[PDB]
Structures are given as structure tokens and as C-alpha cells.
Amino acid sequence: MNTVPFTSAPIEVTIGIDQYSFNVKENQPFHGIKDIPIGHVHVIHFQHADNSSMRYGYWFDCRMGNFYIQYDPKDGLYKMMEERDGAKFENIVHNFKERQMMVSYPKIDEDDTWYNLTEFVQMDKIRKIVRKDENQFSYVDSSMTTVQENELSDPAHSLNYTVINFKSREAIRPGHEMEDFLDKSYYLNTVMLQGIFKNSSNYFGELQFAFLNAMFFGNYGSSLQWHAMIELICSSATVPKHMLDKLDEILYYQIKTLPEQYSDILLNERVWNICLYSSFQKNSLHNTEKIMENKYPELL
Amino acid sequence: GAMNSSNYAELFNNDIKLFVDDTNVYRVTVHKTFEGNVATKAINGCIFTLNPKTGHLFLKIIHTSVWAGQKRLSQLAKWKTAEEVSALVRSLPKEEQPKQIIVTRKAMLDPLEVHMLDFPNIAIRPTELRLPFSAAMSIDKLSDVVMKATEPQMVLFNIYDDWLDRISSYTAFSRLTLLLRALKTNEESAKMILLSDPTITIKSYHLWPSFTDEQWITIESQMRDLILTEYGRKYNV
């Protein structure tokens, strides 16, 4: 079980760790999060009590280094840092644990929610979407734009999601205009899966990462990417059966986890009605259709 | 964006533009079968592609053979239209290519956008104008070439005859839309107005009769009267 210690908590803040969250008071004796499950990526995220603008956070894997949080009073945020001295890090963690100044990652044994949301998400794929090669962890916030949003303004601070555009030369073979526009199978299977992603696991990883940035940061460009990657599969007549079955599992857990009160800002009416009721795959997403009809029948 | 009453003079500026109307591409008669089911029979159609500044009409005849063994014909007709407009643009020299294509029906926007991806600087626009170009097949010489076609054919016309020798493009387009609106509303009455005086003929190289400036004023008044008469008959007003 790995640990992310905190130097201190000088400003009042809501701290997220994956799907969990904890309120910390100004100068509360808080020194971090222990018992973080090894085997998954994690996200540690923040929303300041005195300024709910910028949600921000860090994606990390405790297998890739020893990470801690320290508030920077100049830049006014909680920063993730890596501690390269192993024995120093172990001794800091041991002290804070002995003084019981850490919250425990509150995982229920029966509860596979975080695995279900991150099954295909790899830290190496996150670090290619979020480019800052000097750190092993990745900063994301509410305001970061995508390469696609930027095309339609600082490229070093962008989310490098794969660009999906249904009315683009990449999506439409000259001579197959009607075919490729009404049936996106070419674009999904040849361009995206065989060409860019190499396999469905990488495609699902990016879809899962987009959803999580949309949900945890209210990152609008990430929500656009999540819906575009769903629509691209649902709008293809030819999809491997294993991919349709896996997509239904992926979306079921995403809809299950979404806060009920954020459905209005996080779900695109057009895409979901098209995907569940009109598309080639309208009958392929039985679990997702059932949770959407029971949880969000207004949207539909 | 959308072409409307506000930006009407834009149609007659020096930026090349075409109207595309797909109404008459897929044309059928509906009939009973022997077993008492209903079937369609396609007839030849046409794409109406018009330069409103110059009157140049690119009439692409759609021969019934293009529907043979195809499904979802009303959908396919939009994509075939877009395919043929794209082919016409590629056929024109660079300096003759349009800067804008205005579709009369919003269902043509996606098909035409996707066929024109190779031309990102040609704007594809809808219009809020209700244009009567469906009535093109009320112009006897256009109907005749469409019906006689035995294969796909492009036929070029000037839909303004020689009117631009005497009037502006704005006025010629206004006359054209008035004539087509009258032909759409009451074809028989409109044709009677146009052919009533035998001494006024249609030149071999024209679509419309050879009216003097004073006769065109009378004809235009009679067409307005027909349209108002028909509106009163329709609404009991």
C-alpha cells in the first residue's frame, strides 16, 4: 500500500483521491493519504475553499516513484513533487503514520469501482496526452484546452487527445463519401484502431481518461473527447463483439459513478439519444441503456 | 452563414456563387400493383445549379438508370447531388470555381460539405429564402431535355435569355423567381399568361418569350395577380 504525504495544508481545500473526497481546514494537521492500492493509476485533486475556480490535480502511479504534496504560496497551489531519497521518504511517512496524521484510502473490499473506471488507463499513455517529460506524474485542471479546441492557445499546457472529426479527410475516403459518413467503420477500424491507437485497449484507455478529467475537473474538452470516442464506435456498423461488450461495461461504470447533480453539464443529449436509440449499436449496450433509463430518464 | 433577405444584394456581387436545388433529382409516380400494394416508378430528374449573377444554369440530367438496384433512394439522391456538384466544380477552371454554394434545402449541407472537403475555401451555405426552383420542370425546354435523356447528360443554359442586355442581375433574378413562383402556384394559368399573344414567340436559343420592356411589366403584373388570386382561393381570403 503506497502513501502520498503532505508537507502541510496551509489553505482550506477539498481534496479528492480517485472517487473519494475529504474537506481539510486552514492549517489543519493533515499530512496525507495512506493505503493507496497498488496496481492502478490514481488522481489526487483539489478545489480551494476560498476560490472554487481551478479544480486541478495530478495523475500518478506509486510504482513509478515516491510522490508528495507541498503547498507553494507563490503559485498558490498544492504541487506534487517526487522525493528521490528513498530512506528520507520512508522516515517522513513512518513519522506521519505513527502520529495518525494521514487519511486512509477508503476502499471497500467488494468495491471494484476504481478498477472498472481505470481498467485500460496507463500512466505512459497519460504522459503522452499531458506532455511534461521532467515529471513522472501529470497535472490536469478545469481550464486546460485540447489540441482540437486550440485548432478551432499555449500548446505546452494542452490535452493532446487524438483528434476525431467526422467531416475531415481523415474520416472520409475520397470516393466513399456517403459510405464513410453514414458508416464510420473505416474511420474506427483502419484509421483509429489499426493506425493511431494500435489496439482497442489504448482506445479505451484514452476514452476512460477523458471521462475522468471531465468528471473530476469539469474539463469541457475532455467531455467532448469522451462523447466523440463513444459516438465513433456507436456510429460504426462493423465493431468487434469483444469491443462492444467491453464498451457496455466501461460506460455502465462511468454512468454509475457520475454525480446525479452533474448529469446536466457532463452528458450530451444528442450523442446519448443517437448512441442508445438510432445508431448501428442501439441494441449492443444493454447494461448502459438500462442504467441511463433508470438514472437519467429526463436526458432521454 | 445563412443567406436571407438581409444579405440579398450579396447574390449579385462579383464573388462567383451557385445555388443548388435538389428537389427534382429523385422523381417518382406512385401506383397500385396487381396485388393491390403500392410501388414507385422513377422518372428522369435533374440537378438545378444556377449562377444568379450571370444566369448560367448547369442542368445535370439524372437518368433513372442511376437508381437501379439502389436502396434508400431519397437519401442517395442527396449524396448523388453532392457528388455531381463536386464533379462540376472540379471540371471548371480555377478562376470559374465558385467561392460559395448555397443549397436550397438544409438536408444538402452535410452531403455537399463531405464531397467538397478538397475545397476548404468554398463556403457551403443554407438559405432562409423560399426559392421556387422546384418549378424548373414547368419550363417546357428544360422538361423536354430531361424527359428525352437516355443517359446521364449535362446541358448548359442561360435561364435569363438575353435579359441582362437590358436589366441588372438583381432585376433578372427577381423576374425569374416571380415567373417560377407563378408556375409553381398555377402552372396552367402561368403558361397561358406567357403564351396568350401568339405574335410573341420564344427564340430557338431562348427559354422565355421575346417580350419588350413594356410587355414584361404587363406580364410581371399578371404573374403577381395570379399569385394573389391563388392565395385568396387557398385561404378563402
The secondary structure of A238-277 as a DSSP string is ---HHHHHHHHHHHHHHHHHS-GGGHHHH--HHHHHIIII
Angle at A113 between CA A214 and CA A56, to 5 degrees: 30
Comparing CA positions, the residue from B148, B164, B178, B169 lying closest to residue B206 is B164
Do A52 and A45 form a contact (C-beta atoms < 8 A)?
no
Query: For residue B32, what is the enclosing H or E element?
Result: strand B27-32
Best mutation target, A178, A184, A186, A187, to test chain B (most B CBs within 10 A): A178
d(CA B199, CA B211): 10
CA-CA distances (angstroms) from residue B20 to A81, B54, B104, B151?
61, 15, 6, 21
- Judging contacts by C-beta atoms under 8 Å, the chain B residues touching residue A181 are 110-111, 114
Residue of B nearest to A176 (CA): B115
Tell me how close the Cα of B86 comes to any Cα of chain A, in angstroms.
Answer: 11
d(CA B138, CA A235): 41
Q: Which of A169, A174, A177 sits opposite B79 (nearest CB)?
A: A177
What does CATH list as the number for A1-143?
2.60.34.20
Beta bridge partners of residue A17, listed in sequence order: A20, A44
Return the DSSP state at B28: E
d(CA A112, CA A106): 12
- A175: buried, middle or exposed (CB in 10 Å: 19+, 13-18, 0-12)? exposed
Q: Which residues contact B143 (CB under 8 A, 6 or more apart)?
A: B137
Which triple of cell numbers denotes residue B52?
Answer: 444568379
Best mutation target, B71, B73, B108, B114, to test chain A (most A CBs within 10 A): B114
Q: Which CATH superfamily is domain B9-163 in?
A: Prp8 RNase H domain, palm region (3.30.420.230)
d(CA B80, CA B91): 16
Name the maximum alpha-carbon separation found in chain B: 59
Query: For residue B230, what is the enclosing H or E element?
Result: helix B213-235
**Residue ranges of the domains in chain A?**
1-143, 144-300
Length of chain A: 300
Q: Establish if A167 touches chain B: CB-CB under 8 angstroms.
A: yes
Which single residue is written with the C-alpha cell 517522513? Answer: A92
Do B59 and B46 form a contact (C-beta atoms < 8 A)?
yes
State which fold the A144-300 domain adopts. Answer: 1.25.40
3-state secondary structure of B224: helix
3-state secondary structure of B191: helix
CA-CA distances (angstroms) from residue B88 to A190, B80, B104?
31, 12, 18
Q: What is the dihedral of CA B146, B148, B151, B152, to 10 degrees?
A: -10
Check B110 against A181: CB less than 8 A apart.
Answer: yes
DSSP B52-67: TTT-EEEEEEE-GGGG
Residue pairs between chains A and B whose CB atoms are closer than 8 Å: 24
Check B110 against A167: CB less than 8 A apart.
Answer: yes
Which triple of cell numbers denotes residue A18?
Answer: 480517485
User: Could you tell me how far CA A289 lies from the centroid of its own chain?
Assistant: 22
Tell me how close the Cα of A181 comes to any Cα of chain B, in angstroms.
Answer: 8
Instruction: Indicate the pairing of strand B17-21 with strand B100-103.
Output: parallel
Q: Establish if A73 touches chain B: CB-CB under 8 angstroms.
A: no
d(CA B19, CA B54): 12
Tell me how close the Cα of A180 comes to any Cα of chain B, in angstroms.
Answer: 10
- A79: buried, middle or exposed (CB in 10 Å: 19+, 13-18, 0-12)? middle
- Judging contacts by C-beta atoms under 8 Å, the chain A residues touching residue B107 are none
The highest-level CATH class for domain B164-237 is: mainly alpha
Which triple of cell numbers denotes residue A294?
Answer: 433508470
Residue A27 gets the label, from left (phi > 0), alpha (psi -120 to 50) or beta, of left
Which single residue is written with the C-alpha cell 484510502? Answer: A105
Which triple of cell numbers denotes residue B111?
Answer: 452531403
Comparing CA positions, the residue from B51, B50, B32 lying closest to residue B41 is B32
- B64: buried, middle or exposed (CB in 10 Å: 19+, 13-18, 0-12)? middle
Tell me how close the Cα of A157 comes to any Cα of chain B, in angstroms.
Answer: 29
d(CA A230, CA A211): 11
3-state secondary structure of B104: coil
Tell me how close the Cα of B163 comes to any Cα of chain A, in angstroms.
Answer: 39
d(CA A250, CA A123): 18
3-state secondary structure of B168: coil
- Judging contacts by C-beta atoms under 8 Å, the chain B residues touching residue A168 are 117
DSSP chain A: -EEEEBS---S-EEEEETTEEEEE-TT----EEEEEPTTS-EEEEEEETTEEEEEEEEEE-GGG--EEEEEETTTTEEEEEE---HHHHHHHHHHHHHTT-SEE----TT--HHHHHHTT--HHHHHHHS--TT-SSEEEETTPPBHHHHH---GGGSB-PPP--TTSTTTS-TT-HHHHHH-THHIIIIIIIIIIISSHHHHHHHHHHHHHHHHHH--HHHHHHHHHHHHHHHT-S---HHHHHHHHHHHHHHHHHS-GGGHHHH--HHHHHIIIIISTTTTS-HHHHHHHHHH-TTT-
Which triple of cell numbers denotes residue A94?
Answer: 513512518
Amino acid at B138: S
Comparing CA positions, the residue from A219, A223, A255 lying closest to residue A57 is A219
DSSP A23-60: EE-TT----EEEEEPTTS-EEEEEEETTEEEEEEEEEE
d(CA A254, CA A212): 9
Dihedral sign, CA of A133, A138, A143, A144?
positive
Tell me how close the Cα of B78 comes to any Cα of chain A, in angstroms.
Answer: 9
Comparing CA positions, the residue from A119, A118, A135 lying closest to residue A127 is A135
Instruction: Indicate the pairing of strand B100-103 with strand B56-62.
Output: unpaired
Residue of B nearest to A178 (CA): B79
Do B52 and B10 form a contact (C-beta atoms < 8 A)?
no
Q: Which residues 179-198 in chain A show a CB within 8 A of chain B?
A: 181
Do A86 and A66 form a contact (C-beta atoms < 8 A)?
yes
Dihedral sign, CA of A80, A84, A88, A89?
positive
Dihedral sign, CA of A47, A48, A51, A56?
negative
d(CA A245, CA A119): 14
d(CA A221, CA A140): 12
d(CA B113, CA B135): 26
d(CA A234, CA A86): 48
d(CA B20, CA B22): 7
Buried/exposed code over B211-232 (b: 16+ C-beta within 10 A; e: otherwise): beeeebeebbebbeebbeebee
Comparing CA positions, the residue from B80, B129, B123 lying closest to residue B104 is B129
- Judging contacts by C-beta atoms under 8 Å, the chain A residues touching residue B117 are 167-169, 172
Comparing CA positions, the residue from B158, B180, B166 lying closest to residue B215 is B166
Q: Establish if A168 touches chain B: CB-CB under 8 angstroms.
A: yes
- B50: buried, middle or exposed (CB in 10 Å: 19+, 13-18, 0-12)? buried
Check A178 against B79: CB less than 8 A apart.
Answer: yes
3-state secondary structure of B234: helix
End-to-end distance of chain A based on CA atoms, in angstroms?
42
Do B102 and B127 form a contact (C-beta atoms < 8 A)?
yes
Residue of B nearest to A179 (CA): B79
Return the DSSP state at B207: S
3-state secondary structure of B229: helix
Instruction: For chain B, give every residue range classified as CATH 3.30.420.230.
Output: 9-163
